[PDB]
Nucleic acid binder design. Sequence first.
RNA 1: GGUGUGAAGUCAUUGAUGCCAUGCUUCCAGGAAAAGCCUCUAAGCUUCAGAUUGUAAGGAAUCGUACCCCAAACCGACAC
RNA 2: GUGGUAACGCAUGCUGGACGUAUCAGAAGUGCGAAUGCUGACAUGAGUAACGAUAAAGGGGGUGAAAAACCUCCUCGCCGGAAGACCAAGGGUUCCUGUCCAACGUUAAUCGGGGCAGGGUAAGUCGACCCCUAAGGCGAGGCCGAAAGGCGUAGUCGAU
RNA 3: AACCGACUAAUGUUGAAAAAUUAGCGGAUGACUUGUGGCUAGGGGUGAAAGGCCAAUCAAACCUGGAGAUAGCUGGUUCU
RNA 4: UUAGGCAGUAAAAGCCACUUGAGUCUGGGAUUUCCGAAUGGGGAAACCCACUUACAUAAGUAAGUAUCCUGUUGUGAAUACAUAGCAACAGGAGGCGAACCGGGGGAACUGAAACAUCUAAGUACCCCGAGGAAAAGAAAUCAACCGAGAUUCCGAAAGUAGCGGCGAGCGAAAUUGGACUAGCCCUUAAGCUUUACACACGUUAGACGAACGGUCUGGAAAGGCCGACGAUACAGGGUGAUAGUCCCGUAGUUGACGAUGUGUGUUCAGUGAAAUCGAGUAGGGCGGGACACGUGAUAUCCUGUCUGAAUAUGGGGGGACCAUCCUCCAAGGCUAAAUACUACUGACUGACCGAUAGUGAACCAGUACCGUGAGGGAAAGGCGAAAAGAACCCCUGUGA
Lengths: 44, 62, 93, 96, 77
Amino acid sequence: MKRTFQPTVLKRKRTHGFRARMATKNGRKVINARRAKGRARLSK
Amino acid sequence: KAQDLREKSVEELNAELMNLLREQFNLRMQAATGQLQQTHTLKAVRRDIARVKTVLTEKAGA
Amino acid sequence: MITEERILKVLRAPHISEKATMAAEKANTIVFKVAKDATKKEIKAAVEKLFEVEVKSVNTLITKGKTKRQGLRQGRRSDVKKAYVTLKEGQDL
Amino acid sequence: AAKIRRNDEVIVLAGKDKGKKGKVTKVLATGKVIVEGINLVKKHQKGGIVEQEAAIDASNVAIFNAATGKADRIGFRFEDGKKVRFFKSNGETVSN
Amino acid sequence: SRVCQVTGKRPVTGNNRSHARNATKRRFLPNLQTHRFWVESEKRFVKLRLSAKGMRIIDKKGIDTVLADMRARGENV
RNA sequence: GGUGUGAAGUCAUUGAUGCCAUGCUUCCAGGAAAAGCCUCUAAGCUUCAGAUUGUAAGGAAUCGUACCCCAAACCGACAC
RNA sequence: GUGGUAACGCAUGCUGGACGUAUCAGAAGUGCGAAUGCUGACAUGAGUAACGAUAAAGGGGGUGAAAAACCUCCUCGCCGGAAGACCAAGGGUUCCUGUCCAACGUUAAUCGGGGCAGGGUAAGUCGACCCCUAAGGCGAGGCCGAAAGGCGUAGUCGAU
RNA sequence: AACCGACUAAUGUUGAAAAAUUAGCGGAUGACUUGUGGCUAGGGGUGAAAGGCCAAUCAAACCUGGAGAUAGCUGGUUCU
RNA sequence: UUAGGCAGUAAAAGCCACUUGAGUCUGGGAUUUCCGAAUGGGGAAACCCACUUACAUAAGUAAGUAUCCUGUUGUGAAUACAUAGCAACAGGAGGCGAACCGGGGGAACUGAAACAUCUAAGUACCCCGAGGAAAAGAAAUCAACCGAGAUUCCGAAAGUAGCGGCGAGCGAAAUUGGACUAGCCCUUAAGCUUUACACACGUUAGACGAACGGUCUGGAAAGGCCGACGAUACAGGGUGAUAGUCCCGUAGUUGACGAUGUGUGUUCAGUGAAAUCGAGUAGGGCGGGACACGUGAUAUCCUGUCUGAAUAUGGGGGGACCAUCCUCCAAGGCUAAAUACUACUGACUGACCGAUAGUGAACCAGUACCGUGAGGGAAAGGCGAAAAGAACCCCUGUGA
C-alpha cells in the first residue's frame, strides 16, 4: 500500500532545507529557535 | 629558526620555505611507504615552515 | 600557472594496494593519494616536477569515507582523492 | 614551587613503605610520585609476574635531610636572585 | 501605507460600540487624498498623498514650507 | 590456472510493439517555450578588429560513477 | 531478644565498610495499598500460540568443536513479460576480500545485508555542472499595506 | 492482458498486512492512467458533493504558547 | 613561571627539556579553508559560475566587484532651463543575543456559579525600535486663601473616595514618611561624545606564606595514648580511616614590562539645536480611546473626522456649569542620580537536591529515539587506597 513518506531529496530541500528556512521571517525564527535549543540539525 | 629568519631577506626566506616544503614532501612520501622511523621530524619541519611564513608575513609591507 | 608551493602540496602520499601494484606492473600507472583540491592538471605538473617523469594521462576519483561505530560514537572517515597517473612508455617512478 | 622534584632523595611518610628512602623517578601531574624501590606492586604481565614501582601520593613522601637523618619540610627563599629550596629545620639550602 | 505625508496621520484603532455596548475593534483611517500641488520655486507639480487636513495646512503654511518640513522628515518629495 | 592458437563464419525465409516516422492520411478538442543554430543589417570599427576556409600546436576542467531497485539494501516499526 | 496502649523504642549475632548522633529546641519535599496513578524489575498465561505464502526436496563428499540450513558434486522441483537482466528514484558502503559468531538472523550456523580489519568507484564523448527556457519561485526600482509584509516590472532562478 | 480500480465470497481479525490474500469482478483511446516539478493551508484549502480529503488524524489538521483553561463531576488522599 | 613536556580517550612511538627560547600562564600580534547577515551573480547552507583590473602565457594567479540610507561629485530625458534618471566617491546600516525598556497591533479560555456590558487584560502572543539601562523630567503641576515646588522608586493615607448588569469585580488622590536629588537652553546652555595631553587610580600572569614526634590498633593513621608546637593562618580541599602542624591552600605580606579600565583636570572636534519663546495650535462638533472613573451631572488628557481663537489689556487649570479668587504660562528642546534586568565572568553563601532527586542533561544530551515538518524528547553515576584489572596451569571450540 502507498504509505505517506514518498521521499524525494529535492522536495525535502525545497520545503525544509536551510535556504528555504532562511528565505522567510518565520523560517528564520525556526532556525534561531533550533539554534537556541542547541539542536545539532537546524534543517533537512 | 627563531629571529635568525628575520636577519634573512624575503628572497632567501622564500628559498628556505621551498627547501622546507621539499623536505616536508619527502617525509610524507617516506611516512606513507613506512621508511620513516623518526616521526618527530614531521612536526619539526611543519613548525619550521610556520616560523618562516610568520617572518615573511612580518616582512610583507613593513 | 602552478606554483612550486602548490606542486609540493598536491601529492599527499603514494597509494599502496593490490590494485595499485597491478596498475604499476600492467599499465605503467602510479596511484597517488592527492589533495582534495588537486586538479588533473596540477597533479600532472607535480608528478613531472617531483619525479622527473613524463605523464601520459591523469585519472582521478574521490573515495567517500567509511562510517565507523567506535563503540558508542559513530563517525565518518575522511574522503580521499586518489589519482591514477599513467606515465608515458619507458618512464619509471 | 614544587617541594618534591625528580632526583630528590625522599623518606616515605605513610603507607606500607613508611620510613624507607628512595629517589623520586617521576612526578605525575596527579600529585603522585614514583620513587625507586618503594610502592612495589607485582604485575601479572602477558611476560611474567614482575615487581614494578607504583605511584605514591607526593604528600606521603618527604625530602630526606640526610645531615639530620630525618624527614624535613621545604621552604623557598631567594639566594643570589634565584629561588632555592631550604630545609625548614636546619635552614640549609637543599642540593636541588 | 495610508499615512498622510504632510501630517503623519496614520490609521488609528478604536472600538465600534453597539447599543448593547459590544466593543468590536475597528480602525479610523485618515481622509487621505491625492492632490497635485504646483510648487513655483521648483516649477513643477508635486503629487502628495495627504489628508484633507494636510491640505488645510498647506493653505496656511504654503507648499514651500510644507515641502521643506517633509524633506527633513525624509519624505521623498 | 596461465598463455596460444583456433574451424566454419554463408544462404533463404520469417519478422517486430524497434527504425524510415518530428513522416503520410484524417479529425477537432487545433497540438510548449526559449536557447544553441542560419541569416539580415544597426550603433560601432575599417594597414584594424573581426568573418570564412584551411593547416599546425594545445586543451576539454569539476562533481557522480561501488552496491541494492517485481527490493532482506527504497516506502511499509520487522530479513513484513 | 526485649520494652511500651500504640505509632515505635532498646539491645544484640551476622552482613557491611565510614559515618552516625543523645538531650532539648527549631523547620518541614514528614509517613502510601489503592488514584484504569508514574518508573523500573519480576511474575501468571506457558514451555502454550507461532517460527511470515503448500515452489520441494533426496543423496554422496568437504570444511568444522558441531552441518537439515555453509561449500561442492549428482539428481528433483519452482519462476521465466519474472521469482531474469538493466536504469531512474530512494538508500548510503549494504559492494569485494580476510577474519569472527557474543548480540543480530524468529532454529543451528562453519553462513550473512551481523561484528571487525583491509580493499574497491579511473570519463573531452554517460550523468551532473553548463547554455536555454515551462509551470512556478524570488524579485532592484515600483505599487500597496498599522508593523510584519502583499503584489509585481526589469531581471534572475526553476526540468519533468 | 499490462495498467487503474474494488462488486461478491471465503480466509485473516493477538493478521503475512493498522485494510491484505485467494477465487471470481469493473474500466481498459479516455470525463483514461502514470512519473517529475509546481500551486492552493485551517473557519482556510480542495471536493463529478461522501462532511469526503488536507501525512494511518478531520462537523474545523498538526505543533507550541495562553495553560496548572474550567471540571457544582469521577477517582484518589499516606503514622498512632 | 619553572622541571618536566609533546590535548583527551590512550596506550604505545619518535622526541624535546632540565635554570631557562623545554614547557606552562597572561596579554598583544600573525595565520584564520568553506558556509552563515553572507555582500560579485546564482544556489538543494558548507556548492556552482563570473566580470573588471593587474599580472602572468597558456586556458592561471591576486585583488576588487551586494543592497539600501545619507551626503558629495559628476554626468543627464521627455520640452529651454531644469528635474527625474544614471554613474563615481565617502560615511552609515543589515545579523545574533536570557531578561529588563519604549512604542505599534492584540486574544481567548476563565470569573460573573448561564450570558451579551463587565472580567480575564492591555495579559499571552505578533511586530518595530532601543540602551546599559530605558522611560519620565524641570509645572499652562498641586493646593486651598495657608502653602508646596521637575522626574523616578519605596512606606503610609487605603481596600479609604470613587467606579461597577452598583453584579462579579475594579480602585485613586489630597496628604504624609523615605531613597535620590540638578537643572539648563532656543542672542544657542548644561550635559553628552570625540580628541589628544597630562596626572592620579584600579585591574590584568603571579611570589613568599607558621607549626609534630613517639607509641598503639590497622591493609593503610589523619584515629587512640603520651608529650610538643603555630595561630592576624582551626576558610576550604586533598592525602590508603577522621590532619591547625603531610600537601594544596588560608591570614598576612608582596608583584605588572606591556595592555586595559576609571576618575580628574587641560585641550580639540562635534552634538545638544527645535533657532529666536511656540496656530491649523487651544477650544469646539461628531466617533472612539486613556485617566481608579463603564458617559454618568463627568471635569482633565489623546485624536480619526469636520472646524477653529485669544494672543499678558491675553490664555490654561482649580471634577458639570457660572461668578469671585488663587495658581500656572500649552502649542520648542536637552538633563544625572535614586529605578528595572542578568544569557555571560569571578568570589562566596545555603535548616536547597543528592542519581525515580537536583537541570531535560552528574555519563560524549537537546544526544539517542520519534515525527514530512514545526516540534517532542529519553535512559544511562559508584571495582579498589592503588590496576596491583588475575603471569602460569587445568576443562572448553586457540570460545563463552
